[PDB]
Amino acid sequence: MPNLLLNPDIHGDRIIFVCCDDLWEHDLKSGSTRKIVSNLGVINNARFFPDGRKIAIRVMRGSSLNTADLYFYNGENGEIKRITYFSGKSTGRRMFTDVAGFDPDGNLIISTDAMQPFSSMTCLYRVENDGINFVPLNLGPATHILFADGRRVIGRNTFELPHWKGYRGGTRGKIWIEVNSGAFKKIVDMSTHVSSPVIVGHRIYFITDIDGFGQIYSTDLDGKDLRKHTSFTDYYPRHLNTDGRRILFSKGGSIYIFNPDTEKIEKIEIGDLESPEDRIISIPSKFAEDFSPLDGDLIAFVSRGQAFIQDVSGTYVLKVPEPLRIRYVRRGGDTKVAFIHGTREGDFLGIYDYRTGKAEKFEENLGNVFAMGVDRNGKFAVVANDRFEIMTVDLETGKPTVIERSREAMITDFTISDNSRFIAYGFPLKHGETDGYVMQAIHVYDMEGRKIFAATTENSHDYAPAFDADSKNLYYLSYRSLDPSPDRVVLNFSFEVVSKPFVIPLIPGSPNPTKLVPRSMTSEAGEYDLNDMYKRSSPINVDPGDYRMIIPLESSILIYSVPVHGEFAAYYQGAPEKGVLLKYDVKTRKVTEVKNNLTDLRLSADRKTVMVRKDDGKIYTFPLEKPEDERTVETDKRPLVSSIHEEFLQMYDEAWKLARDNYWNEAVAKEISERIYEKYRNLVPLCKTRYDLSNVIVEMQGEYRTSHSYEMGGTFTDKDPFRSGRIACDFKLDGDHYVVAKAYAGDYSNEGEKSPIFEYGIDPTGYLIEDIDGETVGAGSNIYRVLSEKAGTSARIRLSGKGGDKRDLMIDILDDDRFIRYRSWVEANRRYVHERSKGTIGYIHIPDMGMMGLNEFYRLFINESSYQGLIVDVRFNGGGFVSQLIIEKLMNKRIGYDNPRRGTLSPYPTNSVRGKIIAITNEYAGSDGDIFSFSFKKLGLGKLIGTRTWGGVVGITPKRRLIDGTVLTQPEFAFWFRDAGFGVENYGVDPDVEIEYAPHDYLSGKDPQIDYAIDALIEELRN
Amino acid sequence: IRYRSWVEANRRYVHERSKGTIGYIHIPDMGMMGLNEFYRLFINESSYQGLIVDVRFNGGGFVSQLIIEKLMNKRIGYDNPRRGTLSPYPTNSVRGKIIAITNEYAG
């Protein structure tokens, strides 16, 4: 059982590399190996210093390796030391904050965005005093920095891209070179991506897959004389590193060597190194899901692929006796529960009796199940698959019977009448193969006569169907109560609270039960007749709002309400939505609150037990009759047990299946999948850590050669994330004191947009930082570390400005100051554009096409839209989906005015741009950013300036995760531009005028892109 | 109830006569109600070969600019899913030819 070796570095006979997240050293001479450093977290890069004595190491921390920092290793005394306290943000695809290279003097040059507004600004910094001071090289963003003959060699976006093989977009790795002690020239700019550059002698060796596969090449210090050296076919080579003589690298999990002279490739022998305990223990709460209440006051829940029947206490726990991957567990009888078991083949229905033991599992495939339920009389079950089908499975025989198939989306919202006769469900529909919206009408299926009826019309969104105990009326919710709510910032209106409940008596002639129509004055007791029942529909007198569930009770109705709220947290942090359980008494027609701070709710089949999760993450349970009596559902009593190798295989196969099942093009899928399966499956057994699996999985996702194949979430370590103390400032070592080099601030009156020092009425810029919380910082005291240790608290900071000016304030040491830096940048560019255009041009910047984008666009759109000209800077745009909305705005043309008796003119439309518009774009703007760029030109709103963009317009919508929480994504929605097709994918967008931003432009402190834009508009504004 | 009856009648009429190739939308005024009625059908009628934006008897208001901004959208792309139907881009884009009806009772 060998390991998965990777990311090596060489120096003489010694060779360091990564195995099991730890760093190892190998001596070709003796042939021995040893672990030189461990227990720091997950390590992915180790670099030899010039003398070959010390080593710079990049280590990641945080459950999902969301944070990272740099460490030093002295092989002389075995000293270990953290160098940076930036807590750089990183993801699988962009593992920023690493070693850039080493300057002639033998100093370490790092690449980080810790002090930049955009993650992609991984600017270069020289490390001094072991992390005490940081001197910027002002060469712009870079991934590698080499030196040759006194010439700086810069590698842009030159990191590996395993997730996207054959990438040919604008963010492809490129190499520049100095030519005139300050002048730079781009020398390697192939059609494909260039990664991991090295220089042996006077040739730069790098990797690219222009020939259809990853190989090693080189060219003189002029990008000329291209040569193809390797000819691999098994696995792409990665992580090139050298010592000046031979090149080192990894492939398919082994470490190889390439001698530039001999041109010979040889594999280093290392054999087995480490085989940790395969049987691991996990915490059920950390991977729990699908919590459901059963009879006898029992509970059922799924975790890390396993299922359990336990009491609220968590003291008496039973595991369902079934192999890996239980997707769903559902009450199916007094002591019997039905489950959904998933395998590489698909999803299958199962049944288990936690009393006897009988667990007969079915074999009839159901496809990809996403919703499952069982009637109250354990006769059959209802299932929804990704084929958009809703079906009934005989819980006795196993024969699934398709009832109806939607062609728009899955039928996951359904309910069964208590008498097991009707099945009400939401049926997504469209009235055209190209409609912009998808409607949803409730459908009711009768087990007797086997026929479907229309409970609702197909003009809006009707959901949450639910029958009453006696099964006499069907209740449901709908967003039909249209009524606009005003926007407090932008002239706009939205449907905020248009949700309302309705009812439909299954017996014609019977009135709305909530109308309280005296029995003596009605003549019910007719007979079931579901024909044209949508005509008998009636609403229930309850104020409009945002309802997600309706539960009909004897003399009251429970309703789940969700108060209006922003979507920022939900969009970026996946933060759960907050609801509250309300009660409506039919008699008194008065509403009350039953339970708040709810983020999820489940209800028993008997309607007597309520299970819910609150905003604190915990799960509770209480009787509906006495909601005051809730207990906490504990599950962490019994350790969760599993096998790394059994889980890793399971996880690989699922990742491999989703990638295949969700690829936008089914055809390409059948081929790619079948051709990459085995090849990458053989690496799984070499994996020992979640990080090992990641390497295999990502490389296999890259085999689809498409954008948006990401890997997020998942548990990679028990190490806590790195902390970084920030006060929105830039420090500089000057003598024996740190000076406030810069004090970031954007809109002083907005929230969170300036150094917390400003609150004390003083601009820190220029001042000298004496000490923090008593401890003196400076020449012999790392301020970065001290601040790190005070992150998230308030500390006393002694400052000193001009003269005898001395301050001593309690400053809030923030955990992050990115946004403050972003806003600072935007405001700076905004101020710049005004002054340079003599106050005739506006500025607006869009960071992404998500909630934040929408925020920033409107934040300035309301003050900049009425200038002679407008610059819509969308550089570094991270994509999203709201581009269409922003375009629609800019699309407006001013065609009139309102003349008031008093006041100024009112432009019509209000959201109309006054004059000429111009867009700025770089290679760091992609996805929706790609769409926006192409559109801006396509619609002729103005000229596009900048550099070709990213090129990944195949959207995604993950709907399933791995047993460890990992959320993989698959390019499922290919964007087709009219008169261009899918051309944008794997290419990007070409600006009308190309304005590069060379390293020398950064050295001169000039933005050639924004300058051109301004100067260009002034030209158009001469008319 | 009579207004909605009328709109739905005209809507059913436009479908049958255009052999299901034309949509219908009516705007009673340019106030909150207009905004309500426009979107009430705009979401089911905007993707036909043709669209009729009947604005007769329109009582005025101020949200006309907002409704125009919508109709101003031109369809320039689609989203191709692995399962499901095409998604027009923009979403609030009218699919084809539009035609407006107006009388002396719209001001």
Binding site: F881, S927, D928, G929, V954, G955 | S87
Partner: peptide, 4 residues
């Protein structure tokens, strides 16, 4: 939601 078709993020890009």
């Amino acid at each position: 939601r078709v993020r890009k």
